[PDB]
Amino acid sequence: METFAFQAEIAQLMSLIINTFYSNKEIFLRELISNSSDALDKIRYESLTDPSKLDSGKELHINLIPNKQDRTLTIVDTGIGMTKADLINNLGTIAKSGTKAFMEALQAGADISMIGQFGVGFYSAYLVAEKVTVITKHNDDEQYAWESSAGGSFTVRTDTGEPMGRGTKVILHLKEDQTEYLEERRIKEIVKKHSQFIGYPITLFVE
Ligand SMILES: Nc1cc(C(=O)N[C@@H]2c3ccccc3-c3c(-c4nc5ccncc5[nH]4)cccc32)ccn1
């Protein structure tokens, strides 16, 4: 397992998301589903020119999996996934520019719910999670696990868990007072409210 330091900009955004008082936390789900949808759009478009792109899995879907025992909510997609370079370098670049733009918008009067317009909606996960674990598999690399509980660092290591084929799993280790997002009625409510028109099947698993 390798440990990396977040750059100042993104580290500051993570602290803002965790420290700022903001009750409309439910928007985190909309943001993660949108990220999954975007990733599914990407692998699907690539498959239009090269059908073999789907040899790692033809199914294009999004699954929402709650687990009360582990107190986790996992958003699973069979999108394009992320390579090690995406995890460490490429997305670091996006996180920096996206954070700078978002911060300037906030000081102007923008709201936290608009975070997705800046390409860093993934970080809205910290509105409800104390730790986020990302398991991902891209056609051009092996399966990896990215993880962070903030505090200025994140880790990346090869993942020996169940082979995914292709895609991304965002595991939200929920804060003690955010267990409402593990309830079927709550998740169904949020999905219908903000993600009813997503162009891929969203399956809400139950326990
Ligand atoms: N293709 C995908 C991608 C996603 C997705 O949401 N992607 C995340 C994301 C979105 C925007 C900016 C950074 C990151 C990031 C980072 C990440 N943030 C960083 C900040 C600084 N340095 C490296 C960094 N890596 C690490 C893991 C996941 C993500 C979902 C499904 N399919």
Side-chain angles (χ1 to χ4, degrees), residues 5-195:
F6 280 116
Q7 289 185 58
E9 297 79 21
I10 182 59
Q12 183 174 53
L13 177 55
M14 290 179 68
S15 292
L16 176 156
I17 291 170
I18 297 169
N19 303 320
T20 306
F21 180 75
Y22 185 76
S23 305
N24 186 43
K25 295 173 176 291
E26 64 176 46
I27 62 86
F28 81 90
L29 190 56
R30 174 187 71 193
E31 302 305 327
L32 303 184
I33 289 175
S34 288
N35 290 334
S36 288
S37 178
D38 289 356
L40 285 159
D41 286 344
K42 198 169 185 180
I43 189 62
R44 181 183 57 186
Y45 205 80
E46 291 192 352
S47 73
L48 258 36
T49 69
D50 184 358
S52 69
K53 288 274 184 170
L54 296 178
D55 283 357
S56 51
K58 293 184 181 59
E59 300 169 302
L60 299 178
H61 60 243
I62 300 172
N63 296 327
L64 266 28
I65 308 178
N67 190 294
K68 291 180 180 178
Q69 184 64 59
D70 301 345
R71 203 205 291 166
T72 58
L73 176 58
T74 305
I75 293 67
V76 181
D77 71 65
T78 51
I80 194 167
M82 293 166 273
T83 62
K84 186 184 180 185
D86 286 326
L87 290 175
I88 299 167
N89 290 350
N90 305 340
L91 289 166
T93 299
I94 296 300
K96 179 177 178 177
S97 53
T99 292
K100 290 181 179 183
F102 182 41
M103 292 298 270
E104 298 180 306
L106 288 174
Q107 297 182 303
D111 190 284
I112 296 180
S113 70
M114 313 180 115
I115 185 171
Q117 295 181 54
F118 306 89
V120 290
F122 164 73
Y123 281 96
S124 71
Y126 288 97
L127 287 171
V128 301
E130 63 185 7
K131 179 171 69 180
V132 180
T133 307
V134 176
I135 310 301
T136 191
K137 175 69 178 63
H138 180 283
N139 284 337
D140 299 348
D141 212 335
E142 68 182 301
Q143 192 161 305
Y144 282 97
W146 177 100
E147 178 171 78
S148 182
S149 295
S153 69
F154 64 89
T155 62
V156 177
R157 72 182 185 299
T158 51
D159 185 69
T160 54
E162 193 63 46
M164 302 174 1
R166 187 198 62 251
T168 300
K169 297 180 182 178
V170 176
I171 303 173
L172 306 174
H173 296 262
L174 301 175
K175 299 174 185 177
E176 55 175 58
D177 67 341
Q178 306 295 331
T179 61
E180 69 190 74
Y181 299 111
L182 294 177
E183 300 184 295
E184 187 185 5
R185 301 177 71 66
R186 184 67 172 121
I187 301 171
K188 187 170 61 178
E189 184 186 37
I190 301 167
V191 171
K192 178 94 291 180
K193 182 180 183 184
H194 301 289
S195 308

